[PDB]
Design a protein around this ligand. Sequence first.
Ligand SMILES: OC[C@H]1O[C@](O)(CO)[C@@H](O)[C@@H]1O
Ligand SMILES: OC[C@H]1O[C@](O)(CO)[C@@H](O)[C@@H]1O
Ligand SMILES: OC[C@H]1O[C@](O)(CO)[C@@H](O)[C@@H]1O
Ligand SMILES: OC[C@H]1O[C@](O)(CO)[C@@H](O)[C@@H]1O
Lengths: 374, 374, 374, 374
Amino acid sequence: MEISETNIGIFYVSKLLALAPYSAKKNSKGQLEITRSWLFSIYSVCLCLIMVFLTYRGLLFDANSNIPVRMKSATSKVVTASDVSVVVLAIVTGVYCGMFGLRATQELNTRLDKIDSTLSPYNNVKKDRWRAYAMATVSLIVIGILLGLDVGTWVRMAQEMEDTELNVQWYIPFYSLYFILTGLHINFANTAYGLGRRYKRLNQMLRTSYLSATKNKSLLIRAMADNHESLGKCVRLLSRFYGIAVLFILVSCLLHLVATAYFLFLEMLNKRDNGYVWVQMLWIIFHFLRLLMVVEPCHLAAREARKTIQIVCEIERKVFEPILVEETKKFWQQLLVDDAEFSASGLCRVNRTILTSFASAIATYLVILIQFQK
Amino acid sequence: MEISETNIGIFYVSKLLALAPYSAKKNSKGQLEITRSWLFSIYSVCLCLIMVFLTYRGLLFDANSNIPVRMKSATSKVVTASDVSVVVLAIVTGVYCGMFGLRATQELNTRLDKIDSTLSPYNNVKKDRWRAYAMATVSLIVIGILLGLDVGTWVRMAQEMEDTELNVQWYIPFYSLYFILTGLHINFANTAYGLGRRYKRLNQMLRTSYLSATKNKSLLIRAMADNHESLGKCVRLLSRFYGIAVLFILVSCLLHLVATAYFLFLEMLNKRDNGYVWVQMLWIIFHFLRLLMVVEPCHLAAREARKTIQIVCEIERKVFEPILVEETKKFWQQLLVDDAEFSASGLCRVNRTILTSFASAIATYLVILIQFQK
Amino acid sequence: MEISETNIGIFYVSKLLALAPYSAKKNSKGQLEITRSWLFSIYSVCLCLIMVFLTYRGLLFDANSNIPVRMKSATSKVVTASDVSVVVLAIVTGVYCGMFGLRATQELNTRLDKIDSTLSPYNNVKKDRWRAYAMATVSLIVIGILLGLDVGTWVRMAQEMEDTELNVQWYIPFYSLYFILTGLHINFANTAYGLGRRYKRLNQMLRTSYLSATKNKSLLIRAMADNHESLGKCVRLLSRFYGIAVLFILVSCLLHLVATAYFLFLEMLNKRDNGYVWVQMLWIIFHFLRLLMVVEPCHLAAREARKTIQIVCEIERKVFEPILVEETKKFWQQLLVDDAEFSASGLCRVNRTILTSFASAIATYLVILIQFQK
Amino acid sequence: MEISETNIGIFYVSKLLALAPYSAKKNSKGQLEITRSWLFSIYSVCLCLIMVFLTYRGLLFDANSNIPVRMKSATSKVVTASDVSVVVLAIVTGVYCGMFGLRATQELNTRLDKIDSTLSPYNNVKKDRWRAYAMATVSLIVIGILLGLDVGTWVRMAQEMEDTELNVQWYIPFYSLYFILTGLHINFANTAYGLGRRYKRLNQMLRTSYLSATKNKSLLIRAMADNHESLGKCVRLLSRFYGIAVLFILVSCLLHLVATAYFLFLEMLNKRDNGYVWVQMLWIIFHFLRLLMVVEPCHLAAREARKTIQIVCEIERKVFEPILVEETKKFWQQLLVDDAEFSASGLCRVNRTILTSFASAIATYLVILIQFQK
Ligand SMILES: OC[C@H]1O[C@](O)(CO)[C@@H](O)[C@@H]1O
Ligand SMILES: OC[C@H]1O[C@](O)(CO)[C@@H](O)[C@@H]1O
Ligand SMILES: OC[C@H]1O[C@](O)(CO)[C@@H](O)[C@@H]1O
Ligand SMILES: OC[C@H]1O[C@](O)(CO)[C@@H](O)[C@@H]1O
């Protein structure tokens, strides 16, 4: 995860949501330093364990309730349990990654500091801060009104048939855990989008400074080679930090994209109220947007990294000095060798192609289950 | 999309079908210039919106009609809605690509002009114009008689049980939108086939001029290197212009190849008239041909681009001059680096392998659905 | 397809089976010449058309017979029609490839002649002839007793309930077409195995002559580079000749591996005679062996082609002369560039990985269909 | 398989379990020599044949018993037969690989001896021996208590309804064969983990000795190039030795991960005793751990092999001598050329991506079968 004074609200939100128990303390030479927060580590572990235990306790309390609200069936129980358990797994993986990842975070931030140090000409900070804050605020607000609307529609259905108020607020830990899931998505989307933006700036350096004695050109070549190595290693560091968390996030998103669609189809077939149908449509849209927050930044970063050698050849021809050509040859050898694709801890490569495979899964399941219903 | 006086009827047809609101005006130095047509942009947006609203209005009017003609079932409604909605999505994506794509079209045509400028020896214009016009006319005619036959068979079935004339002409916007889909297929097939033909000419240059002082050979090497870069970038420009349109076209084609087959199987099982069965067989053949108009040109272009280094090695050995060998080394470095595969906006690579995967999908669905029917 | 005096019986059998209407006439300078046989081309087209029409006529005659023997059901009809039609498609594709492939065959044989010309030290002809003749004889004999056993078991079942003799010999064209399918498999297996054996000899040249003035070493380097180009181009020529025929062969083999397994499962569930069960087990084994006659030779050829640069590096280090090192550098550049994987006309790459995918299909279908039966 | 005095207990256990009929005899010059044990080869073949015949005899004896214990159904019979037969196939493949693999084992051990000879600085033997012995003991113990618990729960269920003691001990050969399967897993996990650890040491050599006259640096470069070749060839030797055994192990693991899950779901639906449910949960966990003993070591080895050129570039820049740079260029050419991914005899590449595909299979089957049950 990325820690910087460009956008420190994201780090504070992640720490609040028990996903980054860290401390951001400066020294005199700038260089924001990330240290382990022992007071916040125990807070994160306690909050994660308490929230998971609470949502599971509410889950089995609804299951054992006299009139169940959310899980009253042989199949509704299984699907609701799968949804809650996959959300719990995503939360636990995010907390585990944020806890035992201090060294990876420190190394990634140290590399990013040197990356930003030599990217001055197109280092526009205000726009980056505004974009990051807007993305975080929009994500938190959309999930806030989504959880509020979900509470409202479930309250409406429960009151349709202490009545049910405690039965429906038994899922408050579930929505609190959804909040932590949104925070984890915010963190990963910020880090990957920052890596992609730095790759864009790296591509821009060679695109404008060269395709427009002279040892400054050789210095720029060496600095950009170091920058491309640092970005390629930062992608690997991110894959070490949130690789399994992103895997479980993708699994949760696929499971939700299947289960919410199945619930919407069943509810439409039963010819019930329009509120639950609209809420499930909003949930499907939100799940699609959530999926377009992990595959999209990784795809952008990989595509921008791949677009460096294709411009490096241009300097390879548009050079005459015997030293700068050798330097560009080394850079070309790098880009022939380097590969900066995000990996979900080695199981899969996160990019837009997943969007196809997920569909190839969903269009399968939605073809099977529906045909079993009718 | 490609604009040239070699075949200007395709551009005029695309502009008529609300898919290319552009103006082709020359200057004195040849160089056909493509400008944004503000009068035609509003016409395109109005036609697209009106056509989509009209086909949807007819869709729900048939659904709410006293005796529905095309959608009278719980499953027929869903499948017909899926077909109409996927056609609508393809049309909307094509219009959106043709509207917000002026810069990409201008850059692609500017690059293609320089490509054709230095490909004189095998620049045969009359055959290219005849082939493009024949392909466009055949596509439009086949879809015309197909829509006419579909109107006829649906009229026959509707009259089998204002009677039904307004109910059956409620789908005239649907067939008008199918016409725009055919026009979009024509446009993409023309552009991709032109890129492939230029790749073939590029391969022919090095295949005949070298495998048969002398600085003309070095000049030809440099010109062909520039040509291969321009073609590789033109493939990327096309992937930027029609990348998502081709994705939605492939999705529509897969959905139709499944739905038309399911309808044919159901209709054969019900033992009804032979006209609808033959019309659906023709529709399946047309959908297969439509699929063999996006994967086929992209596959041809990629295969012809891949067949350049495999001939570049021949000059790499069949050269003696110290400068021409270095030039061929740079060209070889390009072809080792370059990749000219069309991408459907990053989700998938369009080639003949899709034909396999589509089958692996269809043979799945046609195995499931049929087993659910029997 | 490969024509040589090393094994001319395979070519004669292929010509007899309407799969190679060619003439093998020598000139004084050795160099067996393949010419188009106009007398045999019309024979091949007539035999193919007559056989296809005859098997289809018998198919619909059994379907319309008073007591059908092989197709008396709603599903048995469909599965039997699929089997017969896929066999017919394979036969038609093989005949079409053998007819409009004179130029490809001539070029492939011309390249193979030069390949064998400079592979003298390990050119062992008697073993190659014996292996090819044994493979062809074993394939023909196994299919002969398989068709005989199939005739016997179907006669037994038909007589269990002109009685049925004409109804059961209505499928004699089907088994005659199976004979042509076996001949096509023999042809492709001979050609691909010859390409693989020549790749093995090429790998052996560099493995023994170098890893054991001296311009003979440079001559050997140049000759082996030419040989590797000729083999890589011969693989492409074979992919042009039998690319679609191999695709339809793989489709037929997958369809048969599914259908025969489904029939065996159904017959075991019905608790009928053991003869049909054993015949279907033999048919499944034969279909598996048939599949291990297209993926196996292509996989062997690709694996042996890939094992050339991995030994080329050895000479790259074990050389001292400034000219031989440059020659080995060119050879290494080839093997870095070259790719000699057989392609089924671009849809898929034929290798052992298909064996996995086929299973991933079969284990799917055999899981679905069976669960639908019980 | 790896034979060394570092861990000789694994070899002795494998020989005892009829998976390595070899003899480890030293000569005076160290260099542990592996010879074929004719006394142990016949013992291995007899034990394998007797065990397979015994488990099959017990299988059909339970099937033909008056009151079947494990297979009393139309589907339970099929699933139990599939499990037992896939275990038998894995055992037979392991025995066949261990018998006809003397040359491959000898070559692999000879290469590994030279690998370990020049890896002295980080050659820590005590930790390697402790880790290997602990892994083997833990695997054997976990499978021992698992088979004991399985015997106990099956005895409990059988006594719930000579009573059944001989019927339940009719599966003692099945659990004895499971022991041999565990031994095969131990052998492959030891060999692949040793290859990965040697790759780690190779990566460490260049990571510490260079990234910290001088011909010792060139000597180290040459030695590490030879080491990387030897490791790449040792991976190929392992793929030759246990390639098909690992394929059948993966097939068995997938079949078990599906069948045990189906049994657990059915047993939970039937609302039976908790002991069988907990035993099946333990079996699922053990099968997952077994799967994380073939994909995990191969993935680690491939990932560590891929992390060599990415550090080789560092010496490529951090060198000044004209000879050491040329040596590093040759090493870079290797790592650009080399590929050290384990292959299951060419059908598939064993890595963590399989974990995804297996899930994509399981999540399919568990979606189908369950929907067929309800
Ligand atoms: O409660 C929120 C979660 O449960 C569902 O609403 C099920 O209807 C899912 O769509 C969503 O992920
Ligand atoms: O109306 C044309 C469209 O609707 C169908 O005819 C359904 O029968 C499809 O085959 C076709 O794509
Ligand atoms: O007639 C031979 C063909 O038909 C079947 O026997 C069906 O039982 C198939 O197994 C085989 O391919
Ligand atoms: O007997 C052990 C084997 O049989 C099962 O227990 C079936 O319940 C499997 O889980 C296991 O692989």
